[PDB]
Amino acid sequence: SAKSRTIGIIGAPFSKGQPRGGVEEGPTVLRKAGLLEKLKEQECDVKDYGDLPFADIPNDSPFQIVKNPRSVGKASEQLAGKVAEVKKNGRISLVLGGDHSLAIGSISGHARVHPDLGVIWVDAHTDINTPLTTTSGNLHGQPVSFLLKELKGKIPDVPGFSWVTPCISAKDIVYIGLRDVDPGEHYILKTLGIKYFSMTEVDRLGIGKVMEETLSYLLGRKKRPIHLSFDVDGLDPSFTPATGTPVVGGLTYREGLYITEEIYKTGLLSGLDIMEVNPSLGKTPEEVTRTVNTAVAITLACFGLAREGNHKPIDYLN
Amino acid sequence: SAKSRTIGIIGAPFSKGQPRGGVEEGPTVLRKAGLLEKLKEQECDVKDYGDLPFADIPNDSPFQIVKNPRSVGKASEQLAGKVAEVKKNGRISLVLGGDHSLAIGSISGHARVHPDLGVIWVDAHTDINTPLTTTSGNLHGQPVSFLLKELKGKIPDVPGFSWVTPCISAKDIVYIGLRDVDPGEHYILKTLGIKYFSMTEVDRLGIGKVMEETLSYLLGRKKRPIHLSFDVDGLDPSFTPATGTPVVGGLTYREGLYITEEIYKTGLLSGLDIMEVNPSLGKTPEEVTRTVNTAVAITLACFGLAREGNHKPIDYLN
Amino acid sequence: SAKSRTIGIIGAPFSKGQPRGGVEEGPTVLRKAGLLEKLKEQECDVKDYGDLPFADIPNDSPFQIVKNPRSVGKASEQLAGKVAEVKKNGRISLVLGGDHSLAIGSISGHARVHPDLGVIWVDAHTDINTPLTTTSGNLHGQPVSFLLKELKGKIPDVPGFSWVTPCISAKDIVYIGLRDVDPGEHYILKTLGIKYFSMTEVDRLGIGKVMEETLSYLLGRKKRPIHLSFDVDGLDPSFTPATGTPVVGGLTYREGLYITEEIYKTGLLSGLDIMEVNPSLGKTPEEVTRTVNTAVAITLACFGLAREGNHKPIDYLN
Ligand SMILES: N[C@@H](CCCC[B-](O)(O)O)C(=O)O
Ligand SMILES: N[C@@H](CCCC[B-](O)(O)O)C(=O)O
Ligand SMILES: N[C@@H](CCCC[B-](O)(O)O)C(=O)O
Ligand SMILES: [Mn+2]
Ligand SMILES: [Mn+2]
Ligand SMILES: [Mn+2]
Ligand SMILES: [Mn+2]
Ligand SMILES: [Mn+2]
Ligand SMILES: [Mn+2]
Ligand code: NA
Ligand code: NA
Ligand code: NA
C-alpha cells in the first residue's frame, strides 16, 4: 500500500558471470522459503513478474580472458528491460539472483527511469575490475566498471555489452563490507574517490555511524531513489555460507539487518538486488537453509520488518 | 559481606507458563553447575531458600485461550511471598527459573518491600501481551501486562491472579534485546511510551551507550533498587541454545556480561531472575552445558565478577 | 622495501613455560601455512633467521612451585640475543612461538637496541604473576613481572634468570583483551597504574576507540618503537581454538585485524610476537587450520595487508 512496500519481483536464474553452477537456483530457493507470502504478511503490495527466461548462448568464447561475455551481456540486457518495466509500473524492483554480473542490467534498467539514483553496494568485494584488470575473467567481479561514467574509455568493446551506457558517477555509489579487494580495484577506488566502508571502517566506527554517514552522503544534498545491491557474501560465511566467493570476517547478521532497516526507513528504496545465493554450495542442508533464511530476513527488513516490532494503525487494546 | 553481594537464592522449578517440559529443571542444572559455590568464592554471603514446592493443579482449564492460568497464578503468588521474605531479610533475591511467567511473582514480591524499584528486562521478547492480545495463550509471554499500572483495566479477571496488584508504571521498566515483538505488544510499547533498546538500538549505539542510557534513565532522578529480569533467550542462541523461544541475532556473550557488570557496579541490584533455561532442549549435551555455563557467568557478573579481575583488600605483593 | 615491511623471522619452538606439549610446533605450522611467501607477496623484505635450537636442560627441578625455570630462562636468554641481532640488522623482529614465557627474551632483546620501546600486549591474561603470586607455577603466566622495573625487588633470584634486567616501566605497556586475571595480578595492575582495556572496556568503547586511546597513550608524547606481543588466546576460541589457555568471550577476528591494521599504520612496529599456537590442541584438523590461518592473517595485517585493499605505485588502468 505504501510506496516503500509496493514491489515487483523479478527472478534472474543466471550463473554465467562466474564458474559455479547452482546460483541459478537462487530465485527458486528464495521463493520456496516463502519470500512472497512473507512480504504480503507485512502489508506489501507484491507483484511477481516471474523468472526471466535466459536463452542459452552456445557460441560464447572468451573475450581475451573474460568468460561467457555474450551470455552475461544478454542476461543483463534482458534484466534491464524488465527492471525498467517494473519501475514504470511504480514498483520497487526486487531482483532475485543469480550472480552479481546481473547488477549491470538491474542498475542500468533502474537508471533508465530514475537517472538520479544512488547505489549502496553491500559486498566483501568491490566488483569493479574492468575487462583489462580482471585476472579471473569472471564477470560477476566486474559489474561496477561497466556502470561507471569515469571508466567509459577503459572498458573495451566486449561482445554482448554494446547496449550498455554507463549511468552512475563515482560519487553515486557507497560500498559497505569490503575485505577482499584486488590491487587494480583498489587503484580504481582511490583514483576515483569512491566512498567506501571496508570492514576496517565498520570496526572503527560501528555500523550505526557507517549508515548515518552512508545515507548523509547519498541523500544530504537532496533526496533521490536508492538502489541496494546486496551480495550475500557481504555477510560473514557463518551466516551465508552457501555462496561462491566467501570471505571470513564479514558483516554480522545484526549488521545486515541494521543496514537494511535503515535503508527502509528513508522511504527511498527504489531497487533491490539479492544476489549470489548458491544452494549447491552448502556443505550441509542446514548451511543452505541458514543462507536462504538470512537472505529472506535481509529482504524483509528492506520492506519494513523491524526488530522492535510492527503494528497496523488500529487500537490493539480495543 | 557487601550489600551488593548478600544473596537469597530461590529455586522456582515451574514450567506451566509455556508448553515445553524441561524448564522446571533450570534450578537443578544451575545448582549442579556450582552456582552457589562459585558465588561464595567471590565473597558473597549466600543463603539458599531452597526450591519452591509448586503443588499440582489438575483442574486448570484454559481461560479463553490462556493456558494453565491457575497453576501460573498460584506459582507466582507463592514466589511473591518468598521473594518478599528474602527482601525483608536484607538480601538480593536470586530467582532461578523456570519460565518467565514467574516474573509476575518475582517483581510483585520485590515491590512489596521496595515499591520504588526499576526493572531492566533482558529478552528477545517484550512479554507484554495481555490475556486478550495473546495469540499463543502462553503466560510466559504476558507477565509485564499484569505488572503495569497503565494496563489495569485491560487485564480481565483471570483465575489465579486475583492477588495481583500492578506495581510498576510504564516509566519504571527498560527493555534490552528485543527482536521478536508481536503487533499488539508493539502497540502497547508505543502507546505507553516504554523505554526500550531493541537489537536495532544496540546495533546503532553499542552496548556501552545502551547501558549508560538505561541506567541514567532509571537512576538519574534518584537512586532506587534495580530488578533485573534476565531471559536467557535475550542472548543469541549460539550462546544459550537450550531455551524454548530462541531468536537469532541476539545479544552476544560479551554484551550479556557488559549489561550485568554495569548493573552490578551501581550497587543497586536488589532482585534478579535467571529465567527460561531448559536443558531438555539442547540438541546435544554440549548445547546444554553451553547454555547453563553462560547463565552462571551472567549470574556471577551480577554479583561482582569482573572481566578485568577482582582482588581482596590486602597487599598481594606481601 | 619500506622499514615497516622489512622483517627478520625467528622461530622459537619452545614449550616449557607451560604444561602442554605441542606449542613447540607453532613455528612449523605457521611456516607450513606459507607465512614467509605471503609476506613476500605483500612487498616485504623477509629474512628467515631460522628456528632457535633450544638445548634440553634435563636437570631443572622447580624453584618453589615455579616449573622448568632454567629451561625457560635459557630459552629467553637465547631469544633475547637473536632478537637484538635482528634489530641491529635494521629489521622488525617476528618471533613465532612457542609459549608466552618467550616474551621475556623477545622484549628484553628488543629493548637492548630500542630502550624507548612501548609494548602492546594482546591476551586474555595479564601474564604478570610473579614467582611468588603464581599458583600454577607456569612461567608463561609470569613474563611481564620479570620485565617491569617497578617489580624488581618482588622477583626472587630464580635459576635461569640472572641475566634479566627489567627494561620497561608500568607506563610503557598497554593490555588489550583481558578477561581472566588472577587476584594478585589484578592487585599489581591497579597498584602500578598500568593502562588496560579488558573485554569490558572493549565492549564499552568499541575497538575503534580502544586503538585510538592505546596509540595516543603510547605515542602521544613522542614517537617510539612499538613491540606487539600477541597471544592467540586474546581472540575468542571460536577463532583460535588450538591454544592451551582458551577463555570464552574474546576479541573477534575483525577486532584482531583492526588492532594490527592500526598498529601497522603507525609505521612504528618494531617487534612482534605471535605466541601460543598449539596445533596438538585442535579438537579436529579444521580447528588447527582455523587457528593457524587466523594467526597468519593477524601477522599479515601487522606488515600492511589491509582489508580495504593494497596496490603498488603504478597506474593500473594503463
Ligand atoms: N575480485 C575477484 C572476485 C569477484 C567476486 C564477485 B562477487 O562479489 O560478485 O561475488 C574477481 O574479480 O574475480
Ligand atoms: N510473544 C510470544 C512469545 C513469548 C515468549 C516468552 B518469553 O520471552 O518469556 O520466552 C507469545 O506471546 O507467546
Ligand atoms: N594466570 C594463569 C594463566 C596464565 C596464562 C598464560 B598465557 O596468557 O601466556 O597463555 C597462570 O598464572 O597460570
Ligand atoms: Mn558481488
Ligand atoms: Mn563479493
Ligand atoms: Mn521472557
Ligand atoms: Mn523471550
Ligand atoms: Mn600470554
Ligand atoms: Mn593468555
Ligand atoms: Na558474491
Ligand atoms: Na524465553
Ligand atoms: Na595463551
Residue numbers in the entry:
A (entry chain A), B (entry chain A), C (entry chain A): 2 to 319
Please share excerpts from the published article on this structure:
Arginase-1 is a manganese-dependent metalloenzyme that catalyzes the hydrolysis of L-arginine into L-ornithine and urea. Arginase-1 is abundantly expressed by tumor-infiltrating myeloid cells that promote tumor immunosuppression, which is relieved by inhibition of Arginase-1. Arginase-1 is therefore an attractive target for the development of new drugs for cancer immunotherapy.
Therefore, we prepared and measured two crystals under identical conditions, with the only exception being the pH used during soaking with ABH. Both crystal structures have a high resolution of respectively 1.50 and 1.66 Å at pH 7.0 and 9.0. During initial refinement of the Arginase-1/ABH crystal structure at pH 7.0, we noticed the presence of substantial difference density in the Fobs-Fcalc map around the N-terminal residues Ser5 and Arg6. In addition, the electron density revealed the conformation of the N-terminal residues Ser2, Ala3 and Lys4. We expect that the presence of the purification tag has reduced the flexibility of the N-terminus and allowed visualization of these N-terminal residues of Arginase-1 for the first time. During refinement of the Arginase-1/ABH crystal structure at pH 7.0, we also observed a strong difference density in the Fobs-Fcalc map, consistent with the presence of water, or an ion with a low molecular mass, close to the manganese cluster. The negative charge of the surrounding Asp232 and Asp234 residues as well as the boronate anion of ABH indicated that the ion carried a positive charge. Since the distances to most surrounding atoms were close to the ideal Na-O distance of 2.41 Å, we suspected the presence of a sodium ion. Thus, we conclude that the binding of ABH to Arginase-1 introduces the binding of an additional sodium ion in the active site. At pH 7.0, the Asp232-Oδ2 atom is strongly coordinated to MnA2+, but has a distance to MnB2+ that is too long to be considered inner-sphere metal coordination.
